[PDB]
Each structure stands twice: as structure tokens, then as C-alpha cells.
């Protein structure tokens, strides 16, 4: 019997689809993380961070989840919290989408909106205040540094890719937000299955902090339009040691690529999906990668 006890267990087993108007003779294949509870990759880390907090006793009946997240992590935690019966508080700037506020409210989140001028720093600050006010009551899962993030990718996302490609996958391209996807995937394929694939991080040209760091240059973040990626810092969940290459993509190209995925491939992916594909396409059209099977994470849906 293939029935899930709750919606948290239903994560993953996302499909690989071949692109027809990207790459060279279908050397580019996409993994559609849009096909998940809460419509993004974050469903996996949402599920596993909660599961892990349960196993280690940091999360019990009565204790509340608190997390600062402007994005899909909040949505993921909301779904899992509802599916597993936890109260949850999320903090972010008043400067959010009314659709996200409403959907988050719909999901049963105690929403706490911080000054828009103060940005995500204000939201971390506030989340920290809330936990500090009653440490026995509130648990911060800390998506950027919690090992349960890349662990789920090593246990599910990566093995799915290995399985689906009969281990013929040669290159994995993934935008970096928390870094968990690239970390966990790379660890699975390289460490557990033992194939020396090329792991390609993607980040905005507008905020190329990984590229700058690896070049030994001054780190100079900037604002960009590609949601999900470009934190403006190297997260603790980004394992530099497994990264073979870093490609930068600009906002406009990422957006054009997302639109092309929709109109040409019939795939409903978000801007960060566009970024990932733009980067993969670049490498796919180098002779050196002409006979390599390239797997691209599409993190979310449109």
C-alpha cells in the first residue's frame, strides 16, 4: 500500500524531462522540483528539518517553529507544520507579496512582518528576539546552516537523479540559495555512488559572491531579481569542497530563459529555473560538454 501518513512524506520522486530547444541533441535534462508539495524543492528540507528536530528532541508537542524566510522555505514549513500539527511563526519584511502573506495565513502561519527598509536582517533580528523571549517554547530550524538541509538532498534528490539516469549523469547544475541542493546532490553522486561528475553552482552576476571568494577577490553582493538564489554570502550549507565550477547568470537572461521554458518546452518554472538552464545551456554548447548528460535543477514552478 502506497499511501502517505501525512503530506510531509510525499516529497520528491520528481521527473527528469529532456529539453528540445536547449543544449545539443538533448544533452540537457531538467529535474522539475515544481512537482512537489508546496511547489518547490524546499518541501524536502521543510520535511527533513522538522523530522530531524523531532528525532533529536528539539521539537516536541507544544513547542513552536520560528524561522525567518522571505521565500519557499516559509511555504514548505507552513505545509509541514500543518501536516504534522505544529504552530509556526514566520518573520519577513512588510514588503512581501500579498499572495504569499494570504497563502501563508491560509496555511495557519502566525505571520510577523518587519520593517521593509531593514530587509532580511530585520527579519532575522526579529526571529532571534522571538526565540530569545521564550527559548523553551520556540525552535529556529536555521535553513542556512542546518545539516538536515543537504542531508535530505543526499538521501533523496541525488539518488533519484542517479537512479533515473542509470548513473550516466555527468554534470549537475543548480542555483545556490542555501546551498543544500548542490551540496547534498554532489555528496550522493560523488561520495556514495562514486562517480566524478562536475558540480556547477549558479549565482547572479549581480551578486557573484561565490565567484569572488574563489577568485580571492573582495566579496561585493548586490540586489537581483532571481528569487531563491544570491544570498549575498556563502551559506554554511554550501560545501565549497564539492563545487567544480561556478557560472554567473544575469537577471534578464534568467527571466528570458524561464519564459522560453514555458513557451518552447511547455515547462512552468520560476526565474531561478531560468537561471539554472541558462548556465547549463552555456556549458552544453562547449564541445568539452557535448557528450555529457547535464542535469539541471528547476527549483520551483512559475
Amino acid at each position: 500500500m502506497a499511501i502517505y501518513a501525512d503530506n510531509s512524506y510525499s516529497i520528491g520522486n520528481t521527473p527528469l524531462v529532456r529539453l528540445k530547444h536547449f543544449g545539443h541533441n538533448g544533452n540537457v535534462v531538467v529535474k522539475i522540483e515544481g512537482r512537489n508539495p508546496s511547489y518547490s524543492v524546499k518541501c524536502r528540507i521543510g520535511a527533513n528539518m522538522v523530522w530531524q528536530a523531532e528525532k533529536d528532541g528539539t521539537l516536541t508537542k507544544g513547542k513552536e517553529i520560528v524561522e525567518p524566510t522571505s521565500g519557499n522555505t516559509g511555504i514548505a514549513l507552513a505545509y509541514v507544520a500543518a501536516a504534522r500539527g505544529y504552530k509556526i511563526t514566520l518573520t519577513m519584511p512588510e514588503t512581501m507579496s500579498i499572495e504569499r502573506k494570504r497563502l501563508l495565513c491560509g496555511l495557519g502561519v502566525n505571520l510577523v512582518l518587519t520593517e521593509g527598509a531593514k530587509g532580511m536582517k530585520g527579519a532575522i533580528a526579529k526571529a532571534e528576539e522571538i526565540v530569545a523571549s521564550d527559548p523553551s517554547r520556540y525552535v529556529m530550524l536555521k535553513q542556512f546552516e542546518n545539516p538536515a538541509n543537504p542531508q535530505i538532498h543526499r538521501e533523496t534528490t541525488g539518488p533519484e537523479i542517479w537512479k533515473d539516469t542509470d548513473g550516466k549523469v555527468d554534470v549537475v547544475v543548480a542555483g545556490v540559495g542555501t546551498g543544500g541542493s548542490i551540496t547534498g546532490i554532489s555528496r550522493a553522486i560523488k561520495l556514495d555512488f562514486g562517480k566524478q561528475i562536475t558540480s556547477v553552482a549558479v549565482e547572479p552576476v549581480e551578486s557573484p559572491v561565490i565567484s569572488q571568494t574563489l577568485a580571492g577577490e573582495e566579496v561585493k553582493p548586490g540586489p537581483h531579481k532571481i528569487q531563491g538564489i544570491g544570498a549575498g554570502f556563502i551559506p554554511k550549507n554550501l560545501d565549497l569542497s564539492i563545487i567544480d565550477r561556478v557560472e554567473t547568470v544575469d537577471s534578464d537572461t534568467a527571466l528570458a530563459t524561464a519564459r522560453r521554458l514555458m513557451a518552447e518546452e511547455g515547462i512552468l518554472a520560476g526565474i531561478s529555473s531560468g537561471a539554472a538552464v541558462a548556465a547549463a545551456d552555456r556549458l552544453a554548447k562547449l564541445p568539452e560538454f557535448a557528450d555529457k548528460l547535464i542535469v539541471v535543477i528547476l527549483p520551483s514552478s512559475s
Binding site: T69, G119, P235
Partner: peptide
Amino acid sequence: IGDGYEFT
């Protein structure tokens, strides 16, 4: 993420 310290 959704926003680490960037975006829009």
C-alpha cells in the same frame, strides 16, 4: 531562500 540579503 526567498531573500538572504538581496533580491528585488
